[PDB]
Design a binder for this molecule. Structure first.
Ligand code: CLA
Ligand code: CLA
Ligand code: CLA
Ligand code: CLA
Ligand code: CLA
Ligand code: CLA
Ligand code: CLA
Ligand code: CLA
Ligand code: CLA
Ligand SMILES: CCCCCCCCCCCCO[C@H]1O[C@H](CO)[C@@H](O[C@H]2O[C@H](CO)[C@@H](O)[C@H](O)[C@H]2O)[C@H](O)[C@H]1O
Ligand code: SF4
Ligand code: SF4
Lengths: 161, 138, 81, 49, 30, 49, 69
């Protein structure tokens, strides 16, 4: 009922701010994002890696196969993996040497669940390095790979119009 | 944050005030006396009404509490406190310590002033080029 | 040095003279008289930033003061954050 | 809050970028950064050039 | 084989940079 | 040399010193050359234009 | 005071959190190793960097026939 929730700016204290509002926090947005890392960690990553790798994968095709350097290609290759498959490699390790910001190094192991987590204090890290690996390892097999059922597909395609 | 509201001091929301590395370093909340409820300027673009107390709002960095302070003594009162919080409680305890109101004596603390020699003729250059025999480290 | 900009003078009296500056200065130490006899260049300075609001008012009668620590904190920066 | 590229300590700390930018552009100013002794310096310009 | 001396611009102007922009992110950490 | 090195008691009365000492003139009889060499080249070149 | 949609209605109530979705598509360990080389790593990643980047660059240029600039 309350003019917008029991009317609060933030979670409650005003003072951090973020002026929590729609597009910050509406039952409708907020939800379109929790198997995914925004709030909770669904599973120990390893898997999120490829839905991340892959979805972002078959992107970067018409960007560099329809806007390519000398464009609209007559080659077997593009439509194409090509260079883009090269980008997921540069990308994916530009990605790794960031997982040298956190190492923090363990196996604990839980994608299995005890007791509704809370994480407890997930906010902030508590991702060890042996986590950020299995993500940016999922990234490679998500990038390269997610680059082929892009071109594998014939483009049945829609014409400008 | 509902389950405990301690609050004394009254904004509503802002974009302003502290973002994440207040948790990961050093915290900095200021507290005060009040009479009858008045409407105030802030740090961070503005403003609120006070009432009473603790009257203990928390700020980002130390420049900001003192900054009211000027703020807080035009329109007056004696009593303003500012403490520094960690994560993990204490050391570095900021306004509490002896007296307040700098411009009093009990004691020295501090400061010197001169280093080794006084203001007069350092036309004289720096001297021996750093060796760990001679008193150049304070 | 890690904050070393000399504002010292000779009167170090602080009435209709100088106060301005975010925390850094507790002074009022006395030294065994100077007329008003509150003296020194400083209190302990590992707390705040680098103004020269430090003179702007009440004499230093040689150098102004200024930026110079070099050796620079974050809290002494303003930004980390 | 790590301890990091050395000769300086003053530099070696601030998180803020000044730590890199500056990192490069002391390298050459041997006299009177951390290491230096009149015997270091000299030679530290000799096997330099 | 015929006409093929194109490697000393990526190994250098491309890959050598990869090394150091990676590697030398030792300035951050190692 | 004048700031890191240089030794006012070690140098004194002594011709390199003397250069500091009688310095206010040095920049003036320099600045007098410029200002002259200034407007006089600039009279001749606008006038000419 | 009849009307009010007497506690109307609530939810339980207006909580949400406590079970809004079953979590994830089955795939359990349809990958698990499956491809190891980032699933193995300690230690790697140079190794790979010279490899990927050696092909990309190596065949990336040389030959067959020009097609020139
Ligand atoms: C690319 C981005 C850029 C960035 C970095 C930001 C960043 C921010 N914006 Mg913002 N904004 C942008 C562009 C950007 N904006 C544009 C172009 C507009 C239109 C004018 C706005 C209008 C806007 C408003 C009104 C607000 C913000 C706010 C904010 C802040 C918090 C909101 C938030 O993150 O909720 C999370 C956001 C999401 C979860 C986004 C989900 C939407 C997706 C799923 C759309 C997918 C598209 C779909 C497939 C089809 C659409 C096709 C096409 C037409 C787009 C944050 C600083 C808020 C603020 O001021 O701070 C509190 C405030 O509410 N923005
Ligand atoms: C900043 C911009 C500007 C832009 C817009 C472009 C654009 C382009 N340049 Mg280019 N160029 C530029 C500056 C620019 N250039 C400059 C400054 C130089 C000299 C320094 C060059 C030197 C240069 C050369 C030599 C070449 C180009 C080429 C190209 C074309 C190929 C790009 C490509 O395939 O990459 C891949 C593209 C992507 C992967 C794009 C993906 C991401 C995009 C869509 C941005 C993300 C927005 C996204 C939609 C977010 C919306 C919300 C979302 C949630 C829905 C493209 C027309 C090539 C060409 O031949 O031209 C025809 C050629 O190789 N450029
Ligand atoms: C020192 C540098 C330098 C060099 C050598 C190059 C070189 C190149 N640039 Mg470039 N560029 C540079 C600086 C440089 N750039 C700078 C500073 C800018 C910014 C202004 C750009 C902006 C730019 C743009 C926008 C583009 C280029 C493109 C290119 C390529 C043009 C021809 C081509 O298709 O590549 C030859 C090779 C490749 C692209 C990679 C080949 C990999 C293939 C063989 C793999 C596929 C097979 C399979 C999947 C892999 C097998 C693996 C197996 C063993 C498991 C060429 C590689 C263009 C391009 O590449 O589009 C196609 C275009 O995108 N550049
Ligand atoms: C329009 C452009 C213009 C031009 C022509 C220049 C030119 C220059 N700028 Mg410059 N600059 C500009 C606009 C421009 N700037 C703007 C708009 C800004 C900010 C408003 C700056 C801010 C700036 C700064 C702060 C500096 C310069 C400097 C320079 C000079 C250094 C040249 C160099 O070779 O570095 C080459 C640069 C690099 C090698 C770094 C780029 C790294 C990229 C390629 C990494 C890519 C990341 C990738 C995704 C990760 C993959 C991982 C892989 C590496 C493993 C050069 C004179 C510098 C200078 O003065 O030095 C003498 C420096 O001080 N500029
Ligand atoms: C094109 C240039 C512009 C002009 C006209 C000047 C002129 C001058 N600069 Mg200078 N400067 C400039 C750009 C300029 N600078 C830039 C871009 C920089 C670096 C960012 C500098 C850095 C610099 C330094 C470090 C120094 C100077 C100095 C000087 C003075 C040297 C003496 C001299 O040359 O003759 C004298 C001047 C002229 C020939 C210029 C014309 C001046 C008169 C004739 C004005 C005309 C009167 C007019 C009819 C009345 C109109 C006014 C109003 C009533 C409508 C001179 C005033 C030096 C100095 O101070 O000397 C003591 C020195 O300090 N400059
Ligand atoms: C990218 C930028 C920026 C950001 C961070 C957001 C973020 C948000 N917008 Mg939004 N918006 C923006 C720019 C932005 N907008 C711009 C430029 C416009 C045009 C003026 C809009 C017009 C707009 C409308 C009309 C709405 C939102 C809504 C929303 C919220 C819900 C998104 C959703 O429902 O996912 C859906 C995601 C999908 C991927 C659906 C698939 C769509 C196609 C492909 C089918 C979300 C908080 C909604 C909202 O605020 O609450 C109801 C909605 O009302 N936006
Ligand atoms: C003509 C071009 C070329 C081709 C063959 C494709 C083909 C494709 N793009 Mg695409 N794209 C291109 C250029 C191209 N793109 C360019 C230049 C950009 C600029 C960013 C994009 C940005 C882009 C995005 C963001 C997406 C795609 C998506 C897709 C795929 C889904 C088709 C669809 O509409 O969902 C069919 C949906 C249902 C049946 C439901 C499809 C394989 C994706 C997609 O289209 O999913 C909606 C994703 O949305 N593209
Ligand atoms: C410092 C050097 C000097 C300069 C400015 C250059 C510059 C250049 N050389 Mg080169 N070269 C040199 C000495 C130099 N060379 C020497 C001494 C040799 C014999 C070993 C070569 C053998 C050589 C070959 C085969 C090629 C070049 C090519 C080139 C061009 C592309 C860059 C490259 O990949 O080189 C590669 C350089 C080497 C293999 C020499 C390595 C020796 C080390 C000690 C020098 C690195 C010094 C570094 C600055 C620090 C560029 C114009 C390439 C070209 O023809 O494109 C137009 C071609 O690949 N050079
Ligand atoms: C710094 C100065 C420089 C010098 C030495 C001169 C000298 C001269 N200018 Mg001249 N001029 C100058 C800068 C100079 N100008 C500049 C900067 C401008 C642009 C504003 C002009 C615009 C100008 C004009 C339009 C004219 C002159 C004229 C003259 C001559 C007339 C003097 C006269 O009437 O004497 C008589 C009285 C006694 C000798 C006593 C004289 C040779 C006049 C001329 O007739 O051409 C040579 C003409 O009127 N000048
Ligand atoms: C290609 C070989 C696949 C077969 C799996 C065995 C090798 C897997 C790599 C780990 C090497 C040691 O063998 C391994 O077997 C299982 C991994 O699946 C582990 O069993 C479990 O406990 C491991 C130890 O933290 C964790 O990775 C997991 O919670 C789980 O796998 C054993 O604790 C481990 O000893
Ligand atoms: S500013 Fe100078 S004169 Fe004033 S009190 Fe301080 S030291 Fe004394
Ligand atoms: S501005 Fe200067 S004098 Fe003032 S507190 Fe800061 S350092 Fe001290």
């Amino acid at each position: 009922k309350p003019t917008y929730q029991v009317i609060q700016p933030i979670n409650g204290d005003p003072f951090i701010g973020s002026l929590e509002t729609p597009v910050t926090s509406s039952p409708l947005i907020a939800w379109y994002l929790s198997n995914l890392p925004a709030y909770r960690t669904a599973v120990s990553p390893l898997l999120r890696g490829i839905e991340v790798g892959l979805a972002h994968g078959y992107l970067l095709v018409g960007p560099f196969v329809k806007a390519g350097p000398l464009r609209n290609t007559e080659i077997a290759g593009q439509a194409g993996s090509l260079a883009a498959g090269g980008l997921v490699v540069i990308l994916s390790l530009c990605l790794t040497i960031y997982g040298i910001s956190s190492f923090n190094e363990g196996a604990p192991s839980t994608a299995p669940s005890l007791t509704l987590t809370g994480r407890k204090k997930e906010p902030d890290q508590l991702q060890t390095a042996d986590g950020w690996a299995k993500f940016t390892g999922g990234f490679f097999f998500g990038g390269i790979s997610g680059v082929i059922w892009a071109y594998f597909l014939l483009y049945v395609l829609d014409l400008p119009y | 944050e509902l389950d405990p509201n301690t609050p004394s001091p009254i904004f509503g929301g802002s974009t302003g005030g502290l973002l994440r590395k207040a948790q990961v370093e050093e915290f900095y909340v200021i507290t005060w006396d009040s009479p009858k409820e008045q409407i105030f300027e802030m740090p961070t673009g503005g403003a609120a009404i006070m009432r009473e107390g603790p009257n203990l709002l928390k700020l980002a960095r130390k420049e900001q509490c003192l900054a009211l302070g000027t703020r807080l003594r035009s329109k007056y009162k004696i009593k303003y406190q500012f403490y520094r919080v960690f994560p993990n409680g204490e050391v570095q305890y900021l306004h509490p310590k002896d007296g307040v109101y700098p411009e009093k004596v009990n004691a020295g603390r501090q400061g010197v002033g001169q280093n080794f020699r006084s203001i007069g003729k350092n036309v004289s250059p720096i001297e021996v080029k750093f060796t760990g025999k001679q008193p150049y480290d304070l | 040095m890690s904050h070393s900009v000399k504002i010292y003078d000779t009167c170090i009296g602080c009435t209709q003279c100088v106060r301005a500056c975010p925390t850094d200065v507790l002074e009022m130490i006395p030294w065994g008289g100077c007329k008003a006899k509150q003296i020194a260049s400083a209190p302990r300075t590992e707390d705040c930033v680098g103004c020269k609001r430090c003179e702007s008012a009440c004499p230093t009668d040689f150098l102004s003061v200024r930026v110079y620590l070099w050796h620079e904190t974050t809290r002494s920066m303003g930004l980390a954050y | 809050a790590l301890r990091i590229p050395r000769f300086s300590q003053g530099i070696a700390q601030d998180p803020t970028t000044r730590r890199i930018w500056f990192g490069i552009a002391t390298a050459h100013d041997f006299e009177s950064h951390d290491d230096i002794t009149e015997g270091r310096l000299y030679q530290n310009i000799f096997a330099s050039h | 084989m015929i006409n093929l001396p194109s490697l000393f611009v990526p190994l250098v102007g491309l890959l050598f940079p990869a090394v150091a922009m990676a590697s030398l992110f030792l300035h951050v950490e190692k | 040399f004048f700031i890191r090195d240089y030794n006012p008691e070690q140098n004194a009365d002594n011709v390199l010193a003397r250069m500091l000492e009688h310095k206010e003139a040095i920049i003036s009889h320099l600045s007098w050359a410029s200002l002259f060499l200034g407007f006089h080249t600039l009279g001749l070149y606008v006038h000419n234009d | 005071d009849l009307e009010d949609l007497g506690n109307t209605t609530g939810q339980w109530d207006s909580y949400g959190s406590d079970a809004p979705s079953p979590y994830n598509p089955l795939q359990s360990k349809l990958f698990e190793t499956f491809a190891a080389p980032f699933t193995k790593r300690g230690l790697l990643l140079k190794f790979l960097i010279l490899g990927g980047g050696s092909t990309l660059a190596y065949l990336s240029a040389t030959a067959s026939g020009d097609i020139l600039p």
